[PDB]
Design a protein around this nucleic acid. Structure first.
Ligand SMILES: [Zn+2]
Lengths: 65, 101, 220, 119, 119, 128, 226
RNA sequence: UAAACGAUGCCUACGCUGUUGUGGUUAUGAGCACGGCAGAAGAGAAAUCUAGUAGGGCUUUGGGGAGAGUACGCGCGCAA
């Protein structure tokens, strides 16, 4: 439904109006370092983006994984 | 409304400053507010140096210079055109002027 | 650890000759994590090789995630760094922009010829500031090559590298091209074709190209 | 496309005691719908009180200068007498281009450049 | 003032991109081509267009005009690029470099014929 | 000197707005401990450590994504059980969720427990 | 007489092909930049109401130049509302302009219960505040069967949004109709995005539908070309 | 008594970055006290920011223009 989108980095809902929200998709590495059909997916709000804070935060979470 | 962040003067962390007198009209102006101008002028004009070369008794001669610091009040500086009115974004630009001769 | 396609000795050598590791004198709180010491003679900061390879691998990975590669848009609005983009995009199937990026050209329907992006790539993002700003209106990620003096708000993946020398620009683009091809199985080893490609990308003056033409013709 | 007709539609509506605004808006629709590429209408006089004024309206394309004005532009003027004085009306219409030469000129304006498409 | 005006420069720029191979260094050839292809209704205009087009053609054939893409000279520039440089960093396998770089070489165990910068 | 229970609240409110996950709080009292321990029972904060520095005291805490706001009331008004719903309607956003904390002869308790135990007390603070 | 729609944007291609639903659009926070997208789903159902008409003036050498400014709401009485302003030489033209802005700023509005979850949801979930210029509005949930306790302008907005009971309070210069309209729309919007205790567990994840349908769109690229 | 003005009360908090000063101290990496400057984010009717966040404590003080900081009484002062 219309009310089920939540930001991964700031843990609050994203409103339908936010032009600066974006979704980031990345592939997963294969054995011997090649590519695969499976995707990482992140939903990120505009508030982090206006500040500049997203650069470091994403680097943290790829390490967490 | 407040036109300038520094109130048009360079005083900060002080109560009171010495006054000086305007070169053009002798009005009193605070030292930290007065418009300042530096001059380094030869005693002899450029149009005479070619005569000096035949007039002097010495093998070589260096002309003496004269040195001045002048002070002006706002009204005089604007009228003599040392400074001019500027637009709302230009007002913020600060650059050192040339020494006059 | 992060799963990265292995380093190989000639590749390592290559980047060092290309002077990738020479940063500037200034530094930024965002970029401290990539520096490993400072030249006592020069006050130049030196970039960590192992981290450079990591973020280069991370960039490559996400370039592979987007189908219909035409929707990837590569921009670089400067000579001294022009031809690199023009070849690089062809090596992956992306679209490109070359001159001044007409402001509004992602936002406004009336300006023709540039596709709605799904991923934007930028080199030396002090110029092309408009591109980083404008992608933010259309939900696109951004990947940039960057140097210690400069800092950006909306860049998701900051690949650290010298961006102020024609030796350096060639090295980044040449290597990344190969990785993306490798990850897809289009090539079998990365050391295959070093001096050929890295030279092709490297910028040259008209005055050099005159000399090289005359030489080549004499040899022919 | 005849300004002399439309001006008399206007003059009628003044005597019918209908607002100038509504009258002029209708006239412009008729002129445009019939295919005119633009028009100008001006009303002048003791129109809304003891102080006289003129109100001028422009729509689409109108030419003022040179020989292209003599072949594309058509004008009419009239006046209506009322209890307070005379109100004057000016109408001008720019004719459409017409390849058979009935509605307007055969040849389009001298300054227009068109480049042919490739096979 | 002998400036060409907007429609004359626009038509000039479009014709050189649309028909490039048909044009030459000669005013009379270029005048023949614009007499052939264009709608232009006075010799006064097409004398000025062919004037600007033959002013461009020198600069364009002399290694290009920025803001004027010609496929024939995109090909010429690909030929100049295919005239590949035989200069090399590729053979510079022996190298000297600073201590901080030598320690990065140590901390990542990078093999090769590196030396400390003798400086 | 600032009130210690006020200082606690502003420290976590600002850090939450700045999107930090953890903070150090610099001056701690007995009721500050009990307040934090209340927020842990209802799952608003996750981890608590206390540092015994011999200089007053200090705490390190992990914030959850569920915390929107908290605050202290000063002064600490006395309330009958008849009065508490008035304060509940003034402070909290909804009738469905959130907590108003009251000190009593039975420790710190929330506005629901007041009905269960049949006791008023003194008003202390709130969170949602 | 009518004009067929050719989608200018990538998302526009998906809606015309029939590969997407309006909840998916809102759910993924996708931009809307073609009014036709809203028409496609809601044309049969949208109501509108004009909140204010006013005249504005610019002083010139010749005299005052003047224009008509119109502000209105689009909504469906169930879930959707959007607010739009336009300025033109003519009151009709101004309405046409305002409608574009409204459609490009539609939002879904969530609802809840004053007490227990019996029957259908009927009020705002949570007490919230909205600010615009000098005007502040606060909304509070209300028992079923109280109706809309609301001032002149804001009352129309709650009705179009499909809310049945509310309590409202207000502060500032509410004579300014544009500020009062925008502030009240922010108040309900802020209530929908409140971080409810359940929210963290209700979370779901999916790939963006524009990335998901890339294959089809690449076929459409070649179909348009060939 | 002053346009006795940074027209911004006093203690005490929580708070982003870069740069430049003054005085001590230094594992030479930095700190502590007192400043200037330039952005950001929030805020505000805007201009702008001693103005961000907040039921921390205590004092002064305003309530549409005028008449009026004037009349009468009182206290200080040689008078003003
Ligand atoms: Zn003077």
């Amino acid at each position: 439904n219309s009310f089920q989108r939540v930001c991964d980095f700031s843990l609050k809902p994203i409103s339908s109006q936010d032009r600066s929200s974006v979704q980031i998709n990345m592939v997963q590495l294969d054995e011997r370092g090649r590519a695969t059909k499976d995707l990482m997916i992140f939903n990120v709000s505009g508030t982090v983006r206006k500040n500049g804070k997203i650069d470091s935060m994403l680097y943290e979470r790829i390490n967490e994984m | 409304t407040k036109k300038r962040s520094n109130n048009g003067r360079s005083k900060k962390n002080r109560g009171h400053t010495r006054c000086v007198r305007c070169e053009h009209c002798s009005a009193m102006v605070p030292n930290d507010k007065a418009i300042k101008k530096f001059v380094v002028r030869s005693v002899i004009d450029a149009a005479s140096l070619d005569d000096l070369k035949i007039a002097t008794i010495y093998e070589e001669y260096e002309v003496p210079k004269s040195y001045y610091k002048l002070n002006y009040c706002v009204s005089c500086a604007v009228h003599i055109k040392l400074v001019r009115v500027r637009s709302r974004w230009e007002r913020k630009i600060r650059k050192e002027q040339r020494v006059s001769a | 650890a992060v799963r990265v396609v292995p380093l190989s000795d000639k590749v390592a050598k290559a980047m060092v000759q290309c002077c990738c590791h020479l940063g500037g004198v200034t530094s930024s709180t965002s970029l401290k994590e990539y520096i490993f010491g400072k030249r006592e003679e020069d006050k130049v900061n030196i970039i960590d090789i192992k981290k450079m390879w990591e973020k280069l691998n991370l960039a490559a990975r996400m370039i592979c995630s987007i189908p219909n590669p035409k929707d990837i848009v590569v921009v670089s609005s400067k000579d001294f760094g022009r031809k690199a983009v023009i070849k690089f995009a062809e090596s992956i199937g992306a679209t490109a922009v070359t001159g001044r990026f007409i402001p509004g050209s992602f936002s406004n329907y009336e300006i023709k010829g540039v596709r709605e992006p799904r991923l934007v790539l930028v080199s030396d993002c002090f110029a092309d500031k408009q591109v980083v700003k404008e992608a933010s209106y259309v939900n696109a990620p951004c990947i940039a090559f960057c140097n210690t003096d400069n800092d950006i708000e909306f860049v998701d993946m900051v690949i650290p590298m010298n961006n102020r020398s024609q030796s350096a620009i060639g090295a980044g683009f040449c290597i990344l091209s190969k990785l993306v091809n490798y990850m897809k199985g289009n090539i079998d080893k990365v050391e295959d074709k070093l001096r050929d490609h890295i030279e092709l990308y490297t910028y040259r003056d008209s005055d050099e190209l005159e000399q090289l033409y005359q030489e080549q013709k004499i040899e022919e | 496309l005849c300004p002399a007709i439309q001006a008399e539609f206007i003059r009628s509506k003044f005597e019918e005691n209908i607002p100038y605004r509504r009258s002029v808006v209708s006239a412009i629709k008729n002129i445009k719908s019939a295919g005119g590429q633009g028009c100008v209408i001006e009303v002048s006089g003791k129109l809304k009180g003891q102080r006289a004024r003129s109100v001028k309206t422009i729509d689409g394309k109108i030419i003022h200068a040179g020989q292209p004005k003599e072949e594309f532009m058509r004008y009419a003027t009239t006046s209506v007498l009322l209890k307070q004085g005379i109100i004057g009306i000016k109408v001008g219409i720019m004719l459409p281009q017409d390849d058979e030469g009935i509605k307007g000129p055969v040849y389009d304006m001298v300054d227009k450049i068109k480049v042919l498409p490739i096979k | 003032g002998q400036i060409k005006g907007k429609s004359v420069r626009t038509a000039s720029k479009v014709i050189v991109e649309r028909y490039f191979n048909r044009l030459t260094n000669d005013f009379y050839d270029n005048r023949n081509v614009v007499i052939d292809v264009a709608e232009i209704r006075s010799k006064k205009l097409r004398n000025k267009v062919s004037g600007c087009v033959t002013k461009l053609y020198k600069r364009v054939k002399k290694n290009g005009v920025p803001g004027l893409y010609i496929k024939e000279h995109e090909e010429e520039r690909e030929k100049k690029e295919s005239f590949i440089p035989k200069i090399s960093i590729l053979d510079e396998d022996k190298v000297e470099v600073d201590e901080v770089t030598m320690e990065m070489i140590n901390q990542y165990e990078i093999n090769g014929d590196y030396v400390l910068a003798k400086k | 000197m600032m009130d210690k229970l006020a200082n606690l609240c502003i420290t976590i409110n600002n850090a939450n707005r700045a999107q930090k996950r953890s903070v150090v709080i610099r001056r701690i009292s007995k009721v500050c401990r009990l307040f934090l321990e209340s927020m842990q029972k209802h799952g608003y904060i996750t981890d608590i450590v206390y540092i015994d520095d011999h200089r007053e005291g200090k705490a390190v805490v992990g914030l959850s994504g569920r915390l929107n706001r908290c605050g202290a009331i000063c002064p600490r008004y006395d309330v009958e059980l008849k009065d508490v719903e008035r304060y509940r309607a003034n402070l909290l956003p909804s009738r469905g969720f959130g907590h108003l904390i009251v000190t009593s002869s039975k420790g710190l308790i929330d506005h629901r427990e007041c009905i269960q135990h049949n006791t008023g007390g003194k008003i202390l603070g709130y969170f949602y | 007489e009518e004009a067929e729609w050719f989608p200018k944007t990538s998302l526009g291609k998906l809606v015309k092909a029939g590969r997407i639903t309006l909840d998916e659009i809102f759910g993924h926070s996708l931009c809307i930049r073609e009014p036709e997208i809203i028409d496609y789903f809601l044309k049969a159902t949208l109501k509108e109401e004009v909140l204010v008409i006013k005249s504005v003036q610019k002083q010139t050498k010749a005299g005052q130049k003047t224009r008509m400014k119109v502000v209105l709401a689009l909504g469906d009485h169930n879930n959707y509302i959007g607010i739009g302003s336009g300025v033109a030489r003519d009151v009709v033209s101004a309405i046409n302009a305002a409608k574009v802005v409204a459609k490009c700023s539609m939002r879904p509005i969530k609802k809840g219960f004053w007490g227990n979850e019996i029957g259908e949801a009927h009020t705002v979930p949570v007490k919230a505040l909205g600010k615009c210029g000098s005007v502040k509005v606060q909304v509070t949930p209300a028992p079923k069967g109280t109706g809309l306790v609301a001032g002149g302008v804001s009352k129309t907005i709650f009705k179009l949004a499909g809310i049945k009971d509310i309590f409202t309070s207000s502060k500032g210069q509410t004579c300014t109709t544009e500020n009062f309209a925008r502030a009240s729309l922010y108040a309900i919007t802020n209530s929908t995005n409140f971080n409810m205790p359940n929210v963290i567990e209700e979370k779901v994840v999916e790939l963006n539908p524009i990335l998901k349908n890339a294959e089809f769109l690449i076929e459409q690229e070649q179909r348009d070309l060939r």
